[PDB]
Amino acid sequence: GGDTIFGKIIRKEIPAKIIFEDDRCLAFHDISPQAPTHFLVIPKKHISQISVAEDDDESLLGHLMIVGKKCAADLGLNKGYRMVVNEGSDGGQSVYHVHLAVLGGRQMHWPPG
Amino acid sequence: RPGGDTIFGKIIRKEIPAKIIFEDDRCLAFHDISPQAPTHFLVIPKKHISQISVAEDDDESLLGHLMIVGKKCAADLGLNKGYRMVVNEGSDGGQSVYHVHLAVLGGRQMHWPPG
Ligand SMILES: Nc1ncnc2c1ncn2[C@@H]1O[C@H](COP(=O)(O)OP(=O)(O)OP(=O)(O)OP(=O)(O)OC[C@H]2O[C@@H](n3cnc4c(N)ncnc43)[C@H](O)[C@@H]2O)[C@@H](O)[C@H]1O
């Protein structure tokens, strides 16, 4: 599952505040939250960046968004939220394991960085 | 109507002009009129979904397709240094047009936090 810190989290080698898990993804609170609610949804398959995602992983990527949607509702984000995928240096990608960030609990501003 | 009542539905049906990047049976990619980065485009489903919070479980493939199309368009547009994908939901998310859209921003260093 990869040699990043997110791979270690998936393997339960280091702790994280887990929100949801299934057979193909994991959702957990971000260690550096930028909003009152800030969590990540990651695939268990090690896709390093969205730019290299294959066509066969189309529904898996959508699964991350559906899981993010359901976790946001369970966490009470009834006023809205923002989902973010960072790619590469210009995108500010901090870990080379694809992650969908979900931020809410405050007004999110424009531009988004 | 196919596409919905919003301005994005009218773009889908060619009723209002747009600068189209990619089009298939499931989605449409086009440039944002108010760019927040040197390159800033949107990927929308042709099926009207008002917001991500009301997406159905069976919309999984469609939502993932928006992301795949977004990354393919970003590569075709030469965003080799990277980019940021953004889905705004509701008032706190900054959503104004209630037709789901995935925004792709690149061509400059994006900052943290993402708004
Ligand atoms: N033809 C087009 N082609 C390509 N890209 C396009 C496009 N049109 C939009 N886009 C882009 O799509 C992206 C995402 O869409 P959004 O960000 O969700 O929508 P917006 O165009 O940015 O509207 P705005 O943020 O300016 O809200 P407003 O001040 O008018 O008003 C503030 C709030 O008050 C609401 N409001 C309006 N009238 C009201 C009224 N009488 N009473 C109460 N509220 C009202 C509004 O719904 C709004 O939410 C944007 O980046 C946008 O540039």
Author numbering:
A (entry chain A): 14 to 126
B (entry chain B): 12 to 126
Give sentences from the paper:
We then made an H114A mutant to inactivate the hydrolysis activity of HINT1. The complex structures of HINT1H114A with Ap4A were then obtained through both co-crystallization (HINT1H114A-Ap4Acocrystallization, 0.95 Å) and soaking methods (HINT1H114A-Ap4Asoaking, 1.42 Å). The complete Ap4A molecule was observed in one adenosine pocket of a HINT dimer (denoted as HINT1 Dimer I) in both co-crystallization and soaking structures. The other adenosine pocket of the same HINT1 dimer is vacant of Ap4A, because it is blocked by the crystal packing. In both structures, one adenosine (A1) and the α-phosphate (Pα) of Ap4A bind inside the pocket, whereas the rest of the molecule adopts a unique Sticking-out conformation above the HINT1 surface. Interestingly, the Ap4A-complexed structure closely resembled the HINT1 apo structure with an overall RMSD about 0.238 Å. Only three positions including the residues S107, I32, and D16 surrounding the adenosine pocket had minor shifts of 1.3, 3.8, and 1.9 Å upon Ap4A binding. Of note, the sticking-out portion of Ap4A, containing the second adenosine (A2) and the delta phosphate (Pδ), fit into an adjacent HINT1 dimer in the crystal structure (denoted as HINT1 Dimer II). The two HINT1 dimers formed a large cleft with their adjoining adenosine pockets that accommodated Ap4A. Therefore, in the presence of Ap4A, two HINT1 dimers were integrated into a compact (HINT1)2-Ap4A-(HINT1)2 tetramer in the crystalline state.
